[PDB]
Design a protein around this ligand. Structure first.
Ligand SMILES: Nc1ncnc2c1ncn2[C@@H]1O[C@H](COP(=O)(O)OP(=O)(O)OP(=O)(O)O)[C@@H](O)[C@H]1O
Ligand SMILES: Nc1ncnc2c1ncn2[C@@H]1O[C@H](COP(=O)(O)OP(=O)(O)OP(=O)(O)O)[C@@H](O)[C@H]1O
Ligand SMILES: Nc1ncnc2c1ncn2[C@@H]1O[C@H](COP(=O)(O)OP(=O)(O)O)[C@@H](O)[C@H]1O
Ligand SMILES: [Mg+2]
Lengths: 231, 379, 224, 379
DNA sequence: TTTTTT
């Protein structure tokens, strides 16, 4: 449990959707690059039109990622109902992951609940027709293999609720070597919609799920069994 | 009128449900009469017999509540009780009853009028019921090793065969048999062979049924002899020491009537039908408290005088007095007996002996000329 | 083929019959649909529904609407939205997956308040104490007490006793793996919390719940 | 036609629910043949298996009424009884059955065809089943300390290994072993090691089963031996005192049979399966009521000749005539033993011993030449 | 001890 596993301050980003695998392994500057928190801000400032796709650098070396989810509801929601919707969304989501973390991961239930509802980071799309965001739980660390196994129970939860936000959970993002668009960039050179930060979080260090910094309030859990015995 | 009432009438017409004397409802499924008290089997029979009904009636018989309604209609039509186990020359199996007077094995509707309740618990395999087989050769070798067929052991061998074969007919006997022999002689091997041969119609109870009063309070050992065709009382304790109760002659005289008295725990039933062939596995001479003519005519004894030993005790057994022949012990015999290897061969041997001996009538005769206590009374 | 294209359809097996699905939609619109006869299993996502407004709309509570509504299918639920100005009418969703009380049982078992102990009992968590009983189960009491921490659309169903009995029956069939109790030996369980011994701090509430202490002293802790 | 009937058929034909001979139902969940007479687990099995059905069949497995209907429909299809615990060379754990022929361990559907009822009570972890480990070395040191492998003590060592390894297979043992030794020698150490190794398949009761009758009244000590694989008899009192109870021979003869007769309190089932190895922990020379050749072939004795003590009575231990070697006592042994530090190591050692000794067949041999009471009859 | 329970 060395020093390098209790921290990850290097960011691996893409520059265009659908990069071929050959370009990824060769790590050519033309498509993929390495970055730090400060350098990422300068690059976004210097390129107000660029497109970046945050992803994991190496899988088997570092699987430690934060908990993140995606929501895309194709309907506007007024402010009061939006607030009420997000309260039920967190209560249901925090409980569901905690139950899975306790039954198949051997972790303590109440520690997970406290670490999630306490500090969470929320984004906000600039589009007005639809409501989408990227909720990243700031103090819940686990392996990517856990999220892949968790995909089934999350899908069941999304199809078994009445709250519009939790029913529109994007469960297809949970795969191998996934990609999450960084806040402040477009999806294609033709699109005009970008994500904007929300108070009270101002640092961009609170919106990258690959940033690992285990502090005094963070919790860790993962499977004891592997993905080959789970037939 | 009602459609389910017609279903109940049709199920009653085929005569598959009967009301017994004790109050149970016996059914007829898988070619064998079955019964239970805590969970009645009427619905199981209804579902099983569903297929033998017309097309429009079969689909009606899948919903559980409709089956319960049919069962309720059926239970309101059984008013007259019917007695059971009236044929004493039949050996019911799990898929029919094997007739003993001529060796035929009926099944299905033919094996139905013989209302037999108890069953061996295993099916009948006609392929292995043939006389010529290596298993038959091995079994004959073992039987001849246990009881050699010499002239000095002729009456003893006949008595052994008769006693062993009497364990098939479901009638009432009138004698008790003592398997007397020294250590490691073949008594337990014969017991296990018989148990594998007949199966469920074989129970082993304690010695308490012989030296203790069987009327006061519950006595489930007596209650477990109901309709069994063989009972073994193994390991009779010695009486040369003090503190050992003598064998009550009253108990022996009370074990040879068609109805013994005893009740199980938490029940009031006090009558038990007695079809049991009682055999006592002893190691020493038995002693009684009272001797009279009524006791000497209800005792028989067969002697085992062949000792199976290892090469270590060969000279010790050779110079002994209780043995007449010494043979090599076998290791796999006790192993493969439990696997039911000599089951059907022994069954065929038993039925052959039964048809040879008890074909006109079945009866056992006492041989009181072997006990020294009765030898004194031979005055 | 379609297997490599998308694992999605317009009506997958497992969904309820289309007539039943529309019936659920029809009960949300309290008024009567005018062009109901234009709907089938192949164009219900394109035909606009022209509602007749005799009573105020059951969705936005307005007197009348300028434009007809229109259905849409996403993730196994017929979302109802209004064309024209999207902010005039709110959003209502029609689930069509299955039983609702099963979802209630799943979401009550989710919060980790019912557990199957090693011996075979059913421990609950009410009034900050892991109380339990064999002769008189307290599952229904736990359901009625925990109805508070659930969304609004679940409270209306946790009042009738037969529904609570159904939820209890569903819960008892999901607990298949047992959990041991009383792992920490240096803790003192009280009626309103667990008192630590290594540092003297007295925990309470959710914080004093991970210490699964079955027994209790029987009295309350008075810090005064 | 019907929809729940097909669901019940799919539950039945996969061979998940079975019916036992006593009338109870055993189900298969969590990779274990668990059963409850008061709480039917059929609904739990149905709700757990709902995931392996087409999407149009799952929606019907949510209403409690529908699951009860499916259970009722299933109950009316089990007609033939099935006997359990037939394989005598399989050790069942909580999460699977470990084979003993080749040492492989199965789980899930593989460890299901063997209808194992009882279990060790703890899960099996393959990561601690290694051959080289500090726990292995400490356990080997302990074993070599308790039974030194000298040429003077070779036969005793292998007899001890054989007796310990016999406590895994589920066959019927035919000998009784005496752990005869002085006080504070290490008998309780072996008892605790075995209890940690096999867990729930190990019981220890009083000495009353050796100096009392086994038929009069209830006998809960007999009902505790059902399907147990090892029985330890400790706290055997000395017999050289006044009026001390003598070891009854008849109990010894009756305790080595495939079926021991005895009924628990408030019950009537009198038969019991004897899969248990009986080990007796005495301190002095045992005396019986009567010695005969029938008792000569059911007795085995191992000798412990290594005393443990603290430096207090070191010279007394070194000068004593009943010992052969004295070493230093340890205090933390009983601490880490109860924490099961030598759980899987002793299990692997036992498996290796069993594969070494009893791979063709299982059989325990007697040794009559170890007690002078039995050396008297050398004439 | 069983019966009584339950
Ligand atoms: N025909 C045979 N061929 C080979 N071995 C045999 C034969 N008959 C018996 N044996 C073996 O010889 C021994 C005989 O044991 P037996 O059945 O006589 O014991 P028992 O009646 O229980 O003894 P005891 O009277 O001492 O309690 C057993 O080991 C058995 O396997
Ligand atoms: N909102 C509606 N607008 C127009 N017609 C409707 C509406 N709701 C229901 N209907 C009509 O009512 C019919 C009722 O059919 P349904 O499937 O409910 O039959 P049911 O349950 O057997 O009972 P019943 O036909 O007596 O109502 C539908 O087939 C449809 O033609
Ligand atoms: N090989 C050994 N190494 C260290 N300590 C031992 C060893 N064998 C026995 N002991 C210690 O001896 C003590 C008593 O031995 P015990 O097993 O009670 O003997 P007995 O069973 O004859 O009474 C135990 O507390 C144990 O710690
Ligand atoms: Mg024998």
């Amino acid at each position: 449990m060395d020093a390098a596993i209790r921290g990850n301050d290097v960011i691996f980003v893409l520059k265009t959707i659908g990069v071929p695998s050959a370009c990824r392994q060769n790590e050519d500057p033309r498509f993929v690059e390495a970055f730090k928190c400060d350098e990422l801000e300068r690059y976004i400032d210097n390129n107000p039109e660029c497109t970046l796709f945050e992803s994991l650098r190496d899988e088997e070396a570092y699987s430690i990622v934060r908990i993140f989810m995606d929501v895309d509801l194709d309907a506007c929601l007024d402010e009061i109902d939006y607030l009420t919707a997000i309260q039920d969304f967190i209560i249901e989501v925090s409980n569901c992951v905690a139950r899975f973390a306790f039954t198949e991961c051997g972790a303590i239930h109440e520690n997970v609940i406290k670490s999630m509802r306490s500090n969470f980071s929320l984004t906000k799309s600039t589009n007005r027709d639809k409501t989408s965001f990227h909720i990243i739980f700031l103090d819940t660390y686990t392996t990517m293999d856990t999220l892949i196994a968790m995909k089934r129970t999350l899908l069941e939860l999304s199809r078994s609720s009445e709250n519009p936000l939790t029913r529109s959970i994007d469960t297809a993002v949970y795969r191998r070597k996934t990609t999450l668009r960084v806040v402040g960039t477009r999806k294609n050179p033709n699109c005009d919609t970008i994500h904007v930060m929300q108070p009270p979080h101002d640092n961009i260090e609170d919106y990258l799920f690959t940033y690992v910094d285990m502090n005094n309030n963070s919790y860790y859990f993962s499977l004891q069994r592997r993905l080959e015995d789970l037939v | 009128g009602n459609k389910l009432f017609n279903i109940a009438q049709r199920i009653l017409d085929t005569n598959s449900v009967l009301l017994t004397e004790r109050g149970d409802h016996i059914v007829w499924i898988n070619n064998s009469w079955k019964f239970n008290s805590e969970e009645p089997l009427i619905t199981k029979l209804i579902l099983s017999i569903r297929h033998q009904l017309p097309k429009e009636y079969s689909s009606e018989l899948l919903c559980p509540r409709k089956r319960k309604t049919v069962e309720a209609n059926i239970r309101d039509m059984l008013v007259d009780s019917v007695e059971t186990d009236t044929y004493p020359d039949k050996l019911p199996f799990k898929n029919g009853v094997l007739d003993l007077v001529d060796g035929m094995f009926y099944s299905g509707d033919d094996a139905k009028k013989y209302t037999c309740t108890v069953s061996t618990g295993f099916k009948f395999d006609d392929t292995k019921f043939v006389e010529d087989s290596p298993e038959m050769e091995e079994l004959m070798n073992i039987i001849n090793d246990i009881q050699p067929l010499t002239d000095e052991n002729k009456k003893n061998r006949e008595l052994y065969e008769k006693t062993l074969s009497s364990c098939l007919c479901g009638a009432t006997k009138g004698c008790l048999t003592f398997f007397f022999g020294e250590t490691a002689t073949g008594k337990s091997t014969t017991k296990r062979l018989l148990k594998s041969a007949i199966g469920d119609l074989f129970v082993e109870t304690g010695q308490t049924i012989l030296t203790d009063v069987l009327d006061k309070g519950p006595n489930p050992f007596i209650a477990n002899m109901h309709l069994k065709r063989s009972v073994f009382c193994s390991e009779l304790p010695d009486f040369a020491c003090s503190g050992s109760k003598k064998i009550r002659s009253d108990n022996i005289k009370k074990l040879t009537e068609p109805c013994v008295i005893g009740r199980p725990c938490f029940s009031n039933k006090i009558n038990n039908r007695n079809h049991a062939t009682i055999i006592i596995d002893t190691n020493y001479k038995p002693v009684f408290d009272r001797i009279d003519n009524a006791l000497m005519r209800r005792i028989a004894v067969v002697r085992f005088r062949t000792h199976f030993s290892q090469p270590s005790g060969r000279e010790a057994a050779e110079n002994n007095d209780a043995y007449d022949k010494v043979k090599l012990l076998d290791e796999g015999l006790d192993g493969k007996i439990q696997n039911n290897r000599y089951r059907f061969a022994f069954l065929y041997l038993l039925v052959k002996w039964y048809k040879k001996y008890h074909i006109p009538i079945m009866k056992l005769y006492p041989t009181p000329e072997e006990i020294p206590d009765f030898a004194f009374y031979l005055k | 083929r379609l297997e490599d294209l998308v694992p999605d359809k317009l009506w997958e097996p497992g969904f309820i019959s289309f007539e039943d699905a529309i019936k659920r939609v029809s009960k949300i619109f309290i008024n009567s649909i005018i062009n109901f006869n234009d709907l089938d299993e192949n164009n219900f996502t394109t035909v606009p529904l022209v509602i007749d407004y005799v009573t105020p709309c059951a969705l936005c509570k307005k007197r009348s609407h300028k434009h007809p509504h229109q259905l849409s299918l996403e993730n196994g639920a017929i979302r109802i939205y209004k064309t024209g100005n999207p902010h005039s009418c709110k959003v209502k969703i029609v689930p069509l997956d299955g039983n609702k009380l099963f979802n209630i049982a799943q979401r009550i078992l989710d919060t980790n308040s019912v557990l199957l102990t090693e011996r075979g009992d059913h421990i609950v968590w009410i009034n900050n104490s892991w109380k339990f009983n064999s002769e008189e189960p307290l599952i229904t009491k736990l359901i009625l007490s925990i109805r508070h921490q659930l969304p609004k659309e679940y409270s209306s169903e946790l009042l009738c006793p037969r529904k609570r009995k159904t939820v209890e029956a569903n819960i008892r069939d999901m607990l298949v793996d047992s959990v041991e109790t009383d792992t920490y030996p240096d803790k003192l369980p009280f009626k309103n919390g667990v008192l630590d011994l290594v540092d003297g701090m007295f925990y309470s509430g959710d914080d004093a719940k991970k210490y699964t202490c079955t027994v209790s002293t029987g009295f309350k802790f008075d810090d005064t």
